[PDB]
Amino acid sequence: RPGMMDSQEFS
Amino acid sequence: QSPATISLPQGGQFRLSISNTDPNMIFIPGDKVTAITAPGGMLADKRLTRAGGVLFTSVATRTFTIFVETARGQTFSVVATPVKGEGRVYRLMSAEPPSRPETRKWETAQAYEKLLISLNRAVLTGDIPDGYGEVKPLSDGIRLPGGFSVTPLKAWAGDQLRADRYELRNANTWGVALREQDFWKPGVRAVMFDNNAQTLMGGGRMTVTVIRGNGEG
């Protein structure tokens, strides 16, 4: 996972 | 601590540092970024954000040029030199504003206040509104300060308000100062000095419009 960020879109 | 506001022209190039370990953000006030282009294999991840925003993370160790295109046909270029450190936010702004929005007064005034205003305006114009019709002027409708003499001129009345115009005459031969509050009589709604003159001298003959209440209760 290079340069991968944790982007959690909440409903 | 505060976004680095940068107003570059269209097609402008701005050299700015970005962080190679943490995500960086570019946003344009009032615009939504549509697309972002960079040399292949430089920016690993790009994500849209609420409104117009691009969160990009670059593992590269070389300076590179990145193009951002917004939703109103604006294209800006940025030269990014990655550096170890905190992610940096940049507020991209247009140079010379393309258009000027004329914001209408949103404010609305009270209904009663408008009703008084319209009638006064109509009487002044001389146009008399449909409901209104002519009748007799009231004999004494106003307070007479300092020797003033009032002669009934004209009047019109309607279902909820009535209007009278009187001609003021000054016999004082002194310099007087008008304050509309002096001409108050228990039962008056508004007083208008047709000529907006603060001081009347001898023979100062301003005509004043007073709207009282027809059907007074």
Partner: protein, 65 residues
Amino acid sequence: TVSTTPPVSAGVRCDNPGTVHPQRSRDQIATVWIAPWVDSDNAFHQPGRVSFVVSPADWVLPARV
């Protein structure tokens, strides 16, 4: 028919009532004072004086000397 706003001004180098740089006139402002009143939610209102424009402006050809 179209309006004809200016009566001929008071009567290189041509003396024409027309062809003079036109200016616009001044709007007329009238002030009305509202008597203090109350409203349904029982608020007492002291507005002050309200100024409104009775007449819009009109074109004018300056008098030529």
